[PDB]
């Protein structure tokens, strides 16, 4: 029914520039405000800016004031977030949301504004100061294939920037028992992550286990065979 689709997110160097679009399908702007709300990876929701498309009113979070502007092209029923002077903290998924509006409801009754009833799926902004692909090291199996129970094994993917990285096992054949952990920011300023899986000990040495790591910002994919140690 109601559709809101955001586009434009991408990689951008600090002090750079980006512009997002929010296409609307199924309702009328002017009777619905548009809001940009961003979610930093692992964090919660932070309002960015809002706009009343029919009347062109704008309001900005203080952390954004004087850096981003928001606009709407009434012709195509699409709202725009132009972002400038970007700094590392601006990395987020940028949702666009709508909320019922009224000239009077807006001017005198903003505290009692109706909720944001539709949200898009979001568009990702990654500010990067470098592009570094990952190193991938085997976490070699915890058992010796005679151990006779369950073994764990994995891939350490480290020293890459920026996020994200995606991991699969045996090109996606192996998904049961896989755990891919959220990345951590190390003190070098590079992300590191681990992906592990449990398998039957008896299968080690018969079944091959390959993790597949894909770092779209560096256009790099690494395939690592994880072998038993001795």
């Amino acid at each position: 029914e109601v559709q809101l689709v955001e586009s434009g997110g991408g990689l951008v160097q600090p002090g750079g520039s980006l512009r997002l679009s929010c296409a609307a399908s199924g309702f009328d702007s002017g009777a619905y405000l548009r809001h940009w709300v961003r979610q930093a990876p692992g964090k919660g929701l932070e309002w960015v800016a809002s706009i009343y498309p029919s009347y062109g009113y704008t309001s900005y979070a203080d952390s954004v004031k004087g850096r981003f502007t928001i606009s709407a092209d009434t012709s195509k029923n699409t709202a725009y977030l132009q972002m400038n002077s970007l700094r590392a903290e601006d990395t987020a998924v940028y949702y666009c949301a709508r909320s019922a509006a009224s000239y009077y409801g807006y001017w005198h009754w903003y505290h009692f504004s109706p909720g944001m009833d539709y949200w898009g799926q979001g568009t990702l902004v990654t500010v990067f100061n470098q592009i570094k692909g990952p190193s991938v090291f085997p976490l070699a199996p915890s058992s010796k294939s005679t151990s006779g129970g369950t073994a764990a094994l994995g891939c350490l993917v480290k020293d890459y920037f920026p996020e994200p990285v995606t991991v699969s096992w045996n090109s996606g054949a192996l998904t049961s028992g896989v755990h891919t952990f959220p990345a951590v920011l190390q003190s070098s300023g590079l992300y590191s992550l681990s992906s592990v899986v449990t398998v039957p000990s008896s299968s080690l040495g018969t079944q091959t286990y390959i993790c597949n790591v894909n770092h779209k910002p560096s256009n790099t994919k690494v395939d690592k065979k994880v072998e038993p140690k001795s």
Binding site: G115, L139, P182
Partner: protein, 195 residues
Amino acid sequence: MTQSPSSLSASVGDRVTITCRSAVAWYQQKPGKAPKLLIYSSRFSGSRSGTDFTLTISSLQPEDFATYYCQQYVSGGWLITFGQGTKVEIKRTVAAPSVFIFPPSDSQLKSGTASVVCLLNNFYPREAKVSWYVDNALQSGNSQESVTEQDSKDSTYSLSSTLTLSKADYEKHKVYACEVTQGTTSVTKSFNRGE
């Protein structure tokens, strides 16, 4: 604004109340999905205990296990502010972690740094103490942890602790141990360098 319970464990069909310090809205977001509006100012029902605002779920259905965000429109300046967010997790029985320890790979050692990885697999509840020992000296400041979301099927967590050493330090020492403690029990996996 501040949301009180921060995290909460509850079971299906339970009375659930998270609070939030004249009008607010509540939003439900599940991982990897977008926020969905719940109610403004159904098993969901709002209230206004004193100055603070309250949301209550009556028969918690399996779809309601998610994170909840308080939200308000500030009249002055036409602002919007959000709550820090409260997460409702599935209670289940306690489940001990399968604990595994991984020496650094030989390839990594060539480069001059040694990562040692400890794994806590498929356990509940979430709180656990993980401690590294190198030749019986407890490590401080050189480790980082990461925890998965609650698995949709068996409702448990997995956790990784990663100890980072220079290759020179790693080759000075012999026993590497990962000790994980939960309540009245501790489990310690270990290895000698070189087997």
